[PDB]
Amino acid sequence: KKPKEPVQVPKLLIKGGVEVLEVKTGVDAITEVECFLNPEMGDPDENLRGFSLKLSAENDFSSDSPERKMLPCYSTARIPLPNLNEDLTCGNLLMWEAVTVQTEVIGITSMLNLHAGSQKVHEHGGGKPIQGSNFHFFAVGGDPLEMQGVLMNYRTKYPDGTITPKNPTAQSQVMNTDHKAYLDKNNAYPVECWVPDPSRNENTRYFGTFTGGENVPPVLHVTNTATTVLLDEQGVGPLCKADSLYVSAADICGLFTNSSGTQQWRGLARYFKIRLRKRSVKNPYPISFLLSDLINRRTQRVDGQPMYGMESQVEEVRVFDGTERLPGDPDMIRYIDKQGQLQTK
């Protein structure tokens, strides 16, 4: 007998580099962008790129001043995407959508190089392998990754190259709301000061694991069949608001110990494979919003009294919508117990 007609697979149109993204395609096109990020571990030499500078040990809390070369930082990147609404109809808006990331760490078998300048493990032995507090992280979104500044020892003096959270108090060793930032510069935001903000990242998807010990093994899988789905509860992924895909990562992979014992960090690059598609969305900003930004860019800037913020002078705002039967409570108080009064102790 004869075989059957082959299975319909998606038709490849072009493979190449970054200048391939700008093909005028149809509506149901799907693109797969593949990229990487080098870890910015400090890089103390031009000769030793990929490690950190050697670590200080026991300086006091009130006398702690690290240098930039011994601080691992975050990696970040913006991937420019082409505009998609050039040939469609009117009143019809359509953006990108990250559907699936497939990540992987490059270079993980290089830790088997025990014949390097490592520390000798016993009297006639091999080199000490890389082990210590690792940290693996990646984030894929249509917006820059929005950070949160938490750091122990708020009297650490950081150098000029690192943008660490400004004006630290004793509440910066715990959750402090006044340390919001964006991850908007490579090799600037150190990892020991900034965690991704769990309240503000609605358009990114971040994944991070770490095992912090004196001697823990870096356990690293490597597989091309694993797949992370980026969709939310409603079925949409990270929408690229501006035509931009924001990719960020930070991979600390333990402590390399030198021949004299002087420890230093080591990181590895991280692969990204983002599967994009064309999500039809609604235009949020008509020409009423768009005209009103011209009047914004032509009105005189007054510098008056604080009508917004913490020191605001607006005492009360009522908002009315429809009709209602006359309430018997003209100060329409909602909380039956806001302060906690008249509860049992």
């Binding site: 559907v99 699936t100 069949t225 694993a226 797949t227 992370t228 789905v229 969709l231 079925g235």
Partner: peptide
């Protein structure tokens, strides 16, 4: 994460 062979099944429910 998830295997690649079940990927049209996961996206299909939307």
């Amino acid at each position: 994460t998830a295997p690649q062979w079940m990927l049209p099944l996961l996206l299909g429910l939307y």
